[PDB]
């Protein structure tokens, strides 16, 4: 097994949790091909974000919420929707398919790294910035889906 | 990620949309083994062609329609059926299994390449000629299925 | 695509048709792990043999029928059941699991190689001897399943 | 096919039987990402252990039973549950998710190696010690699942 960073280990879990149908090894081919697929993917991610406390194996805290934005041509216009846990009202989204540039879902998760316990140390803090992108910049009929993260580390 | 041409990017989307059960990396093994599979595959492709506007993530225009042909031994006889969107009457197809040479579904899709917008340029036009082949020339009990395209580019 | 013989092309179709859940590239790992799986596999193969005319994309003729045998310890005892198309009475099979050596399904399919037509030649004849084996000789709790063939060629 | 030991052949069967959704080649990526998945996995393993006689293709004898333990932070506390075939009362398990270190399912299976018969020899005895681990020591939101075994061999 190849070693990765703590953030990366967490990120793999994030891909399984937020990306519908995701499976290991499909990172650079994972994509959407229909409107329904793109809708299900977006909703699944948000639903999962809202259900996180009752399903995740990790212990992530929200950091207020979630921004669902879609960028399309009117000039590029960004159109964002806010989702404040604890749960909805956003399932009436209408994608500007013909004008679509991309769609992004952005949110942050806060957590502790418990590996410190084995060495009798107070765990330090990790705040993950999650960005899920449905990229349509190639306007090719194929929209690749990706999830990347960035971590802010500091003592709690 | 390996770069491919615009036509090729579009073609990958076409394989996911028109080939039933298709999945990346199965291009040279993708095939049919039963009559039902061959029937479902053909119908799925045509149905998808008819539903294109309500499902595709790309913006393809029809170019009048779709030709469903089957070639079999009487001398090789070609037997074509026309499908003019916007939708049917062709689901009563009867495949000459024992005589079957192949079956092809041919149609063209017209679209614009919006990548021009980022450089403030008028998009040029692409007309894709789609050919789906169910090849039975080996008469081996295995019919490989393939989708290939050709593009006609010009200013709109 | 790697060239194989006509028999081999046909054999690939046979694996898709008679082996339940079979998929390309799983030939040397394909196996059964439960009694139900082993029962479903055996029945699926026989059912498929009986339905062959209404489902196969090839044109295979029976050569009278099908022998379902199981070998187990009493000395190794072979216990065969006959299936004469056109269809049953064999679904009451009781596998000597604890004593099981293996199980084999044997039958022959006769057909013509139509590739001759393109060169205006009378097709020669192929008689395939199909042998499906559920090997339990390792008595390891894992029974690998395999299908192999042999061809008898001659003018019709 | 690569040769492995008798124990290893048996172990592969054990992975297919006790690990939910397991498939060949996924050994070092196989993991759980949700509470429900972790619950289903644990229950599936135990249920399978209890049903073993009616489903397995091997002939394994119990060696009294099965220990379902979970380790979590109060200091690391181990909390075990006993399952004595022939069947339950353990499906009311409550996982200390936030405190979870790991979870292990331990049991032993006894059997004979019938390969001796082909050489007219009395089979020797194998007692497999099975250990299924749901490792959460990385506290990364991803819990890798693994099954390993050890064998005690001796004349019966």
Curated annotation (Swiss-Prot), chains A, B, C, D:
UniProt-reported outcome of changing residue 19 to P: In ML4; decreases formation and extrusion of tubulo-vesicular structures when overexpressed; disrupts tetrameric assembly; abolishes lysosomal localization
Result for mutant: residue 27 to Q: Modulates inhibition by Ca(2+) at different pH levels but does not abolish channel inward rectification
Domains: entry comment: The most N-terminal extracellular/lumenal domain (referred to as I-II linker or polycystin-mucolipin domain) contributes to a structure with a four-fold rotational symmetry in a tetrameric assembly; the structure contains a central highly electronegative pore with a 14 A diameter. The pore is critical for Ca(2+) and pH regulation. The protruding structure formed by the I-II linkers may contain all the interaction sites with lipids and proteins in the endolysosomal lumen.
Post-translational modification: Palmitoylated; involved in association with membranes. Phosphorylation by PKA inhibits channel activity. Dephosphorylation increases activity.
Residue ranges annotated as Extracellular topological domain: 1-156
Full-protein interval shown: 88 to 284 of 580
Tissue expression: Widely expressed in adult and fetal tissues.
Originating organism: Homo sapiens (Human)
Subcellular localization: Late endosome membrane; Lysosome membrane; Cytoplasmic vesicle membrane; Cell projection, Phagocytic cup
Region (Extracellular/lumenal pore loop): 20-34
Function: Nonselective cation channel probably playing a role in the regulation of membrane trafficking events and of metal homeostasis. Acts as a Ca(2+)-permeable cation channel with inwardly rectifying activity. Proposed to play a major role in Ca(2+) release from late endosome and lysosome vesicles to the cytoplasm, which is important for many lysosome-dependent cellular events, including the fusion and trafficking of these organelles, exocytosis and autophagy. Required for efficient uptake of large particles in macrophages in which Ca(2+) release from the lysosomes triggers lysosomal exocytosis. May contribute to cellular lipase activity within the late endosomal pathway or at the cell surface which may be involved in processes of membrane reshaping and vesiculation, especially the growth of tubular structures. However, it is not known, whether it conveys the enzymatic activity directly, or merely facilitates the activity of an associated phospholipase.
Cysteines engaged in disulfide bonds, as pairs: 69-80, 125-156
Disease entry from the Swiss-Prot or TrEMBL record: Mucolipidosis 4: An autosomal recessive lysosomal storage disorder characterized by severe psychomotor retardation and ophthalmologic abnormalities, including corneal opacity, retinal degeneration and strabismus. Storage bodies of lipids and water-soluble substances are seen by electron microscopy in almost every cell type of the patients. Most patients are unable to speak or walk independently and reach a maximal developmental level of 1-2 years. All patients have constitutive achlorhydia associated with a secondary elevation of serum gastrin levels. Corneal dystrophy, Lisch epithelial: An autosomal dominant corneal dystrophy characterized by gray, band-shaped and feathery opacities in the cornea, that sometimes appear in whorled patterns. The opaque bands consist of clear, densely crowded, intra-epithelial blisters. Vision may be impaired if the bands involve the central cornea.
The name this protein goes by in its record: Mucolipin-1
Result, substituting residue 24 to Q: Modulates inhibition by Ca(2+) at different pH levels but does not abolish channel inward rectification
Superkingdom as given in the UniProt entry: Eukaryota
Family the entry assigns: Belongs to the transient receptor (TC 1.A.4) family. Polycystin subfamily. MCOLN1 sub-subfamily.
Subunit (UniProt): Homotetramer. Homooligomer. Can heterooligomerize with MCOLN2 or MCOLN3; heteromeric assemblies have different channel properties as compared to the respective homooligomers and may be tissue-specific. Interacts with PDCD6. Interacts with TMEM163. Interacts with LAPTM4B.
Glycan attachment points: 102
